């Protein structure tokens, strides 16, 4: 007969709180107004400081941040040039941490992983201009994301990069958004930037977190790095009786971005990375750093997503795997990056039992690691929606 | 009934309570099930030995379709002359696709070029292609999912890959046409005819409709190796109620079929009507104007149209305005000679044979000129009372 | 049923006979209490190098019986030495297409200009709007040049053409079957007219002069100077009013009288080429034009023509010279070379099953790109034109 | 109904009590009556003067068919060049056969070559031929029942002999199709058109389809004489019961008809579908692939088939396996270009016009290429509600 999973039994005992959460989200999105506003601008030399702290404005229901990073890389070598890596200007930011007003961190990931989830949630390369056949001069007019492909010996290059640091899931789904109408509780957006060490790899180094690589990289340096943060929030919140109208489940659930690093790979043996409990995984990104070398599928036998340790659900070679990615973002990721979409059916071990991610390599070099990147929800329920001054 | 024989209110000759239970049972299935894709067969062969293969898919779950990866290697053993790609290219690696339901019931019987274009038209873009952007981050053509060299020189070798989605269900959210295969009657069949050394290399001046390469060195071009891999997409972990499986009973008893046809007898500056058939629910129409081995970009056509009996021409347009309606569909143009007609918002369903027709008015017609028609359509299990498409 | 599928008594039990007796009473009241008006509804003069397709707004009044279309042209031959000569279809190719839409956006007649001209001939009993030559000493004859065209335009000369077309809606002046009640305030009623232009009206030597007007060695330099058109609408005004609104023949106004053309190819020598008639139409006549690859012959490339039926195979299997003898009893002449007329006005083809009646051409010699250009007139009785199919099949 | 539109149990929408009374009355007639064959008409003419004849036999009994002996004499008045026989040969001595009922209802309207091949197909051997054996007893070709010289030299004269069975009843034990001529109405007609001096001699290069001889002296060949004789097979002493004649009522109101057709519009390497009309009961199909006046032994055909709407191809075979299935039928091969399809065990009977089709996939198509289709079929007296036999 019919038997429900523990995930479906929880969905029937929380079905009146979810109906109240849906009708409170519809009232907020109907009656509020989207505002984007600059909250911080700074220009620094990264030979003195590279870790920065950004205090957001405490207003409305925050949906996310737009970070604009601009750089002025100068090459001081006499006779040798450098060239862009495969991640390029996405390594201008090395780490993004955001802390809640409750001092609970939401997103703690690197710069390349934030860019690829921005790519995956758009359906195209993030803030890119596609090439067409039109005689009307569209195209790369404004240089939103730009970097020169080669900085010569004695030249100077200007870089621009945009990051969307997400808090809410989308502009119509407020799962993960932050109430910020609290004056005494600050937020925090920690931003690590590149240096003259971590951004100019030599010939034979690991260009994973670098920006330029070449035989003149020992004399490449920044001149300045400027950043600008834009806070995107919902102003003019609806107020009924009993205070603000709030999607309580959507504000207590987080939406996170985390990356890891697994090692110890063996040729032609299944490397398994287990999905953890309590998380509802929306996308996995695996990067095969094969010891400072990135190859277009020719060092992988197959990628997979297993149930318990048995009965695979998508076991594909690295071109059939990339064919499912081309239905998502209308291109494929750089060399070594493999994306797995789980947005319609999220990987939830309460629903499916133990689920792992499998990589079977073909060639494993020395210092070869597997760089995971996750994107998920997590709930952790609440009992007080209060915090109102009664002497007002 | 101002234009079509039955409008959408008169086309409600169905039960409308079996339609309500079908839509409810489909939405239950698409929640409690999980999509699995897995390889079912793989074989590497030589086209000089064998060229037609029959593939046995697994009898699991509710089957949604098949992803066929075909990889090939071509040696050009000419002394001095090279060959070049045709307009259809690696999409002619597979010559025929026939699928058979466990009750020995055929579903899709097309060529490979027609199956590729329906894959393009259902994505909104060329199938499994990578768009070219302006990013400094190195996206682009990285993995070479669909790829073929544009020219194989004399004494060189070219490696080329092609993917085909053989559909059974209509889409990922519409389960019309899907096959229940848990406890079947017999095995399923996936007949696959591949390209030969006789069909894949056309000489200078030949008809490059089914060819892959064409040039002066085509007499000394040969295959070395063709591998195929068939993946099966299906829905596992089906929901179970008080009476066994929860099933969309008239989505599984419906056939989402793709079919091919061909009509000849064109004369210049008059209408060449290609009459649709009754009792099919036509969803799209692809016409390929093979003008005697020559393919032109609308230069040999006065107009294209789609008529009715009561109404006149409904979308009579010149070839560049017909192409403008397809750049809103797939965001590019089809190759030369290929014309797409979408009827997905309003399917053709007549009850009289020649009630709706497809019209091409040519202006220059060479000998052995023909229209190569491809159809995708819905039909129930009473396809046995139908007639020929066209 | 021995020849036809439905006998005239069998297809009279498929109709309401009390609604038909009430329909012929309402037609006699309309035809004796109305006034026939003919009125010019549109006129403009153009250059076909600028515009050649026109939409004509008629007048929304009365019960419309048809349209009279006068076309005048001014062809110039800018060649240096060579002249051109008039083709067999001639000035009848001044109009290329005719489409009429009624007040309810329902099309009626969608045919070519040469096919409209031959049905105009076939219903008069003579070549349309022509004057016969007599031996009267009183100066009758061709005084006004109603339909006129010079036979040859020399190098550096100009010719004036004049052509008339009757676009029928009603079947005749005594039978209002096919007429349109147009006293409704709308704008969907129009008369689309595509005219000849500089590409379709001058054919080179050895080309296909089917839709051309002139043909010769100097046809590359022939141009139009000017084309004028004038449209006259014939209708019945002051409709009789009893109670319950107007007194109208309801079956006559819910029936279409249409003219349609189609082309079929695929002829091979010395075997039958059966062009099938269609289900649910009521065919009245049939024009067949044998374009033998740009060549038109006076029956010297046909074995025989015939009409065909499922049981009772051939009904008029005749020689081409004997087929022409049955049309000299109709129009007191014969049609141009390649044109063959089949009359079915006494017993109309109405056949309830698609290819039951067919039209046969047995050719002796078939050139490359040969075809039959059919032309049909029919009653089709709206509420079953929606359930109809294609007008022909081979 | 997996394969056909209506299977044999669904095609039993007849009375089945009038079927058992028809079967009972048929064997009473076949036991009690007596087969009579007698001469109707003999006539000797010149084809330069007259060539079409109308034979009016007497209205006796239950008519089973007609035997037509045609004898001819052909002079070759050329100076130095000779002519040679075609593949169809003396079977083109009769160009057209039409029979009419006493009620002026036509039954068979074919050519002479198609009437000959149906005579071959219903026997199991070439019609009225001598099997070559090894016996020392002098059997063989003694009487020359069907004879023609293979080559008529310059100045020579050749004598031809040819026999035709024009069928009315289907067989000698099945009276389906027979004509009850004991009626108070007019006499039956048998229209016969013969060869001329314009249609029996083809020049070198011309189409030898309706010709008898073909060669470089064919401009000077002419008939000296053609004689014909018509015999009539019928049953007399019909049984009388209590209510008059004992008659197979729904066997005499059924027509066994042979009919001819022709379709054009072939292009290389695509399917050319020729659809089987509804309401006929097709027993056989003869398709002659005239490839522009050239007849080949399967070298210009990829495959032949018989499609269905619900099913796929049912007998898709290469042209030598298709000929292998007819060697189990007539114990030899039909001439070059002639392809035979047998449906006598399960006749085609659709109720929808394009349910079953006949497919030829060519590989080389010349100009004026066509298929010459010949059908034989059963139909009731409601042939008046039928359509064309494409």
- The Cβ of residue D203 has, within 10 Å, a number of other Cβ atoms equal to 15
Q: How far is residue B387's CA from residue B278's CA, in Å, rounded to a whole number?
A: 8
Same domain? For D103 and D248 the reply is no
Within this chain, do residues C286 and C380 fall inside the same structural domain, yes or no? yes
DSSP assignment string, B293-317: S---SSTTEEEEEEEESSS--SS-B
Cα dihedral C2/C4/C5/C8 (nearest 10): -100
DSSP-derived 3-state class of residue B92 = helix
Report the candidate in D118, D86, D366, D71 with the shortest Cα–Cα distance to residue D230. Answer: D71
Residues with their C more than 2.5 Å from the N of the next written residue in chain B, i.e. before a break, are none
Calpha distance C270→C43 (Å, rounded): 50
Q: What is the CATH number for A371?
A: 2.60.120.20
Contact yes or no for A118/A126 (Cβ under 8 A): yes
Other beta carbons less than 10 A from residue A193's beta carbon? 23
Q: Return all residues near D302 (Cβ < 8 A) that are at least 6 apart.
A: D269, D318, D361, D362, D363
Handedness of CA A371, A377, A382, A385 (dihedral sign): positive
Beta strands D213-215 and D201-202 are parallel
Map D87-114 to HEC letters: CCHHHHCEEEEEEECCCCCEEEEECHHH
Residues of chain B contacting D312 with CB distance shorter than 8 Å: 98, 106, 109
Q: Are residues B13 and B143 in the same domain?
A: yes
Closest residue of chain C to D280, computed from CA coordinates? C310
Q: Are A196 and A49 in contact (CB under 8 A)?
A: no
**D270 contact residues in B (CB cutoff 8 A):** 262, 370, 372
CA nearest to B311, candidates B348, B356, B341, B280 = B356
**Do D and C have ≥3 inter-chain CB pairs under 8 A?**
yes
DSSP C289: E
B360: closest CA among B285, B283, B289, B308?
A: B289
Report chain D residues whose CB lies below 8 A from the CB of B103: 2
**Helix then strand then coil, % of chain B, to nearest 5:** 10, 40, 50
Q: Are residues D216 and D302 in the same domain?
A: no
How many angstroms separate the CA of residue B262 from the nearest CA in chain D?
A: 7
DSSP symbol at B148: -
User: Mapping DSSP to helix (H, G, I), strand (E, B) and coil, where does residue B72 land?
Assistant: strand
From D216, D241, D266, give the residue that closes a domain: D241
What's the rounded Cα separation, in Å, for the pair B210 and B7?
39
Mark whether C171 and C205 lie in a shared domain: yes
Which other chains touch chain D, taking contact as 3+ CB pairs less than 8 Å apart?
A: B, C
Q: Taking the C-alpha atoms of A202, A207, A213 and A217 in order, what is their torsion angle to the nearest 10 degrees?
A: -40
Using DSSP's 3-state secondary structure scheme, residue C328 falls into: helix
The answer to whether the beta carbons of residues D169 and D248 sit under 8 Å apart is no
To which H or E segment does residue C343 belong?
strand C339-343
Taking residue B389's Cβ as centre, other Cβ atoms within 10 Å add up to: 19
Give every CB contact of residue A392 below 8 A, 6+ residues apart in sequence: none
- Residue D386 to residue C1, Cβ atoms within 8 A: no
Distance between terminal CA atoms of chain C? Answer: 25
Nearest to B223 by CA among B50, B62, B58, B359: B50
**Domain containing residue C279:** 243-394
Q: Are residues C199 and C300 in the same domain?
A: no
B contacts of C369 (beta carbons < 8 Å): 267-268, 365
Contact C303, C362 (CB under 8 A): yes
Q: How far is CA D234 from the centre of its chain?
A: 20
Same domain for B224 and B154, yes or no, is yes
B229: nearest Cα among A44, A316, A358, C376: A316
Reported as type and span, the H/E element at residue B358 is strand B356-362
For chain C, how many helices (H) and strands (E)? 5, 20
Are the beta carbons of A58 and A180 closer than 8 angstroms? Answer: yes
Is C237:D349 a contact under the CB 8 Å cutoff? Answer: no
CA D163/CA D227 separation, integer angstroms? 12
**CATH number of residue B11's parent domain:** 2.70.9.30
CA–CA dist C308, C321 (Å, integer): 19
- Residue A75: name the closest of A150, A159, A161 by CA: A150
* Separation of alpha carbons A370 and A358, rounded Å: 11
Closest CA to B111 of B36, B197, B192: B192
Task: Work out the angle at residue A115's Cα, subtended by the Cα atoms of residues A114 and A117, and round it to the nearest 5 degrees.
Answer: 70
Closest CB to A130: pick one of B133, B144, B242. Answer: B133
B39, B230 Cβ separation under 8 angstroms: yes
Which residue out of C311, C313, C355 would a mutagenesis test of the D interface target, given it has the greatest number of D Cβ atoms within 10 Å?
Answer: C311
CA–CA separation, D331 and D124 (whole Å): 6
Q: What was the elucidation method? A: cryo-EM
First vs last Cα of chain D: how many Å apart?
A: 24
Return the C-alpha torsion angle D138, D142, D147, D149, nearest 10: 70
CA triple B93-B99-B100, angle to 5 deg? 155
A and B touch with 3+ CB pairs <8 Å, answer: yes
- Check B309 against C389: CB less than 8 A apart: yes
Q: Say whether D310 and B265 touch across the interface (CB within 8 A).
A: no
* Positive/negative CA dihedral, C306, C309, C312, C313: positive
For the beta carbon of residue A74, count every other beta carbon within 10 angstroms.
15
For helices A320-329 and A111-122, the axis angle rounded to 10 degrees is 70
Provide the 10 A C-beta neighbour count for residue A309: 10
Residues C113, C213 share a domain? yes
CB-CB neighbors (< 8 A) of B271 in chain C: 262-263
Segment holding C99, helix H or strand E:
strand C95-101
The 3-state DSSP class for residue B174 equals: coil
- Residue (of D23, D24, D58) closest to D234 by Cα position: D58
DSSP SS3 for C144:
coil
Resolution as reported, in Å: 2.8
Residues D87, D24 share a domain: yes
Q: Is B100 helix (H, G, I), strand (E, B) or coil?
A: strand
Which domain-ending residue is among C242, C258, C279?
Answer: C242
Chain D residue at shortest CA distance from B267: D265
Backbone angles phi, psi at B67, to 5 degrees: -110, 115
Q: Do at least 3 CB pairs under 8 Å connect D with A?
A: no
Pairing of strands B213-215, B201-202: parallel
Residues D25 and D153 in one domain: yes
Instruction: Please tell me the distance from the alpha carbon of residue C250 to that of residue C63, in angstroms, as a whole number.
Output: 12
Reduce the DSSP state of residue C381 to 3 states and report it.
Answer: coil
Cα of first residue to Cα of last residue in chain A, in angstroms, is 57
Angle made by CA atoms B269, B275, B279, in degrees to the nearest 5 = 165
* Candidates C11, C279, C310, partner chain D, best to mutate (most D CBs within 10 A): C310
Residue C218: DSSP 8-state: T
Q: List residues in chain B touching A: CB distance below 8 A.
A: 34-39, 67, 69, 123, 125, 128-145, 161, 163, 229, 231, 236, 239-242
The answer to whether the CB of B62 falls within 8 A of the CB of B155 is no
Q: What is the crossing angle of helices A6-13 and A15-31, to 10°?
A: 60
Cβ pair B387, D356 in contact under 8 A: no
Q: Using the 3D structure, point to which of B241, B260, B282 is the last residue of a domain.
A: B241
- Minimal Cβ distance to A149: which of B123, B136, B139: B136
Q: Are B118 and B286 a contacting pair, CB within 8 Å?
A: yes
Characterise A169 by phi-psi region: left (phi > 0), alpha (psi -120 to 50), beta (else): alpha
Number of Cβ pairs < 8 A linking chain C and chain D: 66
Beta-bridge partner residues of A360:
A302
Number of domains in chain C: 2
Domain check: are A98 and A181 in the same one? yes
Q: For residue C107, what are the β-bridge partners? A: C101
What is chain B's length? 390
* Alpha-carbon gap, residue A168 to A162, rounded angstroms: 18
Q: Phi/psi at C310 (nearest 5 deg)?
A: -55, -65
Neighbors of chain B by Cβ distance (3+ pairs < 8 Å): A, C, D
Cβ partners under 8 Å of residue D173, min gap 6 = D30
Q: What is the 3-state secondary structure (H, E, C) of chain D?
A: CCCCCCCCCCCCCCCCCHHHHHHHHHHHHHHHCEEEEEEEEEEEECCCCCCEEEECCCCCCEEEEEEEEEEEEEEECCCCCCEEECCCHHHHCEEEEEEECCCCCEEEEECHHHHHHHHHHHHCCCCCCCCCCCCCCCCCCCCCCCECCCEECCCCEEEEEEEEEEECCCCCCCCCCCEECCCCCCCCEEEEEECCCCCCEECCCCCCCCCCEEECCCCCEEEEEEEEEEEEEEEECCCECCCCECCCHHHHCEEEEEEECCEECCCCCCCEEEECCCCCEEEEEEEEEEECCCCCCCCCEEEEEEEECCCCCCCCECHHHHHHHHCCCCCCCCCCCEEEEECCCCCECCCCCCCEEEEEEECCCCCCEEEEEEEEEEEECCCCCCCCCC
Residues A301, A361: contact at Cβ < 8 Å? yes
Rounded to a whole number of angstroms, the distance from the CA of B123 to the nearest CA of chain D is 28
Pick left, alpha or beta for residue A66 (phi over 0 → left; psi -120 to 50 → alpha; otherwise beta): beta
- The secondary structure of chain A, three-state, reads CCCCCHHHHHHHHCHHHHHHHHHHHHHHHHHCEEEEEEEEEEEECCCCCCEEEECCCCCCEEEEEEEEEEEEEEECCCCCCEEECCCHHHHCEEEEEEECCCCCEEEEECHHHHHHHHHHHHCCCCCCCECCCCCCCCCCCCCCCECCCEECCCCECCEEEEEEEECCCCCCCCCCCEECCCCCCCCEEEEEECCCCCCEECCCCCCCCCCEEECCCCCEEEEEEEEEEEEEEEECCCECCCCECCCHHHHHCEEEEEECCEECCCCCCCEEEECCCCCEEEEEEEEEEECCCCCCCCCEEEEEEEECCEEECECECCCHHHHHHHHHHCCECCCCEEEEECCCCCEEHHHHCCCEEEEEECCCCCCEEEEEEEEEEECCCCCCCCCCCCCC
Nearest CB partner across the interface for D387, out of C267, C269, C354 = C354
Radius of gyration of chain C (CA): 22
DSSP secondary structure letter of residue C196: P
Rounded-to-integer distance, Cα D337 and Cα D358, Å = 16
Question: Distance, in angstroms, between B152 CA and closest chain D CA?
Answer: 26
The β-bridge partners of D190 are: D55, D99
Contact A345 B133 (CB under 8 A): no
C→D interface, C-beta within 8 Å: 1-2, 4-5, 265-274, 276, 308, 310-313, 352-356, 358, 366, 368
Question: From CA B127, how far away is CA B285, in angstroms rounded?
Answer: 18
Question: Please, what's the b/e burial string for C276-286 (b: 16 or more CB within 10 A of its CB; e: otherwise)?
Answer: bbbbbbbbbbb
Check the CA dihedral C108-C110-C113-C116 and report its sign: negative
d(CA D12, CA C88): 58
Spatial separation of the C-alpha atoms in residues B202 and D156, rounded to whole Å: 52
User: Do A268 and A346 sit in the same domain of this protein?
Assistant: yes
Cα of first residue to Cα of last residue in chain B, in angstroms, is 23
Q: Compute how many other C-beta atoms are within 10 angstroms of the C-beta atom of residue A50.
A: 19
SS3 for C246?
Answer: strand
String of DSSP letters for B191-231: EEEE--TTTSEE-TTS-TTS-SEEETTGGGEEEEEEEEEEE
């Amino acid at each position: 007969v019919q038997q429900l999973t523990p995930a479906q039994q929880a969905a029937l005992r929380n079905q009146q709180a979810m109906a109240a959460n849906l009708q409170a989200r519809q009232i907020v999105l109907q009656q509020s107004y989207p505002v984007i506003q600059q909250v911080e601008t700074q220009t620094f030399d990264p030979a003195n400081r590279s870790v920065f702290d950004v205090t957001p404005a405490n207003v409305g229901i925050v949906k996310g941040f737009l970070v604009k990073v601009t750089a002025a890389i100068k090459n001081n070598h006499a006779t040798e040039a450098v060239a862009l890596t495969d991640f390029g200007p996405a390594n201008l930011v090395q780490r993004v941490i955001y802390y809640d007003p409750d001092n609970q961190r939401h997103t703690e990931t690197s710069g390349w992983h934030l860019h690829f989830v921005n790519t995956a949630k758009q359906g195209a390369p993030f803030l890119s201009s596609m090439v067409t056949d039109s005689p009307i001069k569209y195209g790369d007019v404004m240089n939103v994301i730009d970097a020169p492909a080669t900085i010569a010996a004695g030249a100077t290059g200007e870089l621009t990069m945009y990051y969307w640091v997400p808090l809410a899931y989308s502009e119509t789904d407020l799962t993960g958004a932050v109430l910020a109408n609290v004056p005494q509780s600050k937020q925090r957006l920690k931003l690590e930037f590149a240096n003259n060490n971590t951004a100019f790899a030599a010939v034979g180094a690991n260009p994973l977190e670098a920006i330029y690589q070449g035989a003149g990289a020992a004399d490449c340096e920044f001149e300045e790095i400027s950043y600008t943060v834009y806070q995107s929030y919902l102003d003019q919140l609806p107020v009924g009786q009993n205070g603000y109208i709030l999607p309580l489940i959507d504000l207590s659930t987080l939406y996170n971005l985390e990356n890891s690093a697994q090692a110890g790979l063996t040729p032609n043996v299944d490397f398994v990375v287990q999905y953890a409990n309590l998380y509802r995984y929306l996308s996995t990104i695996a990067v095969f750093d094969n010891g400072g070398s990135f190859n277009a599928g020719t060092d992988i036998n197959y990628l997979s997503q297993r149930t318990a340790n048995f009965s695979d659900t998508r076991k594909l070679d690295p071109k059939t795997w990339a064919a499912q990615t081309r239905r998502r973002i209308a291109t494929d990721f750089p060399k070594g990056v493999y994306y797995c979409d789980n947005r319609d059916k999220p990987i939830y071990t309460l629903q499916y039992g133990n689920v792992g991610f499998v990589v079977n390599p073909k060639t494993v070099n020395q210092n070869a690691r597997l760089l995971m990147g996750y994107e998920y929800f997590t709930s952790r329920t609440e009992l007080v929606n209060a915090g109102t001054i009664s002497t007002t």
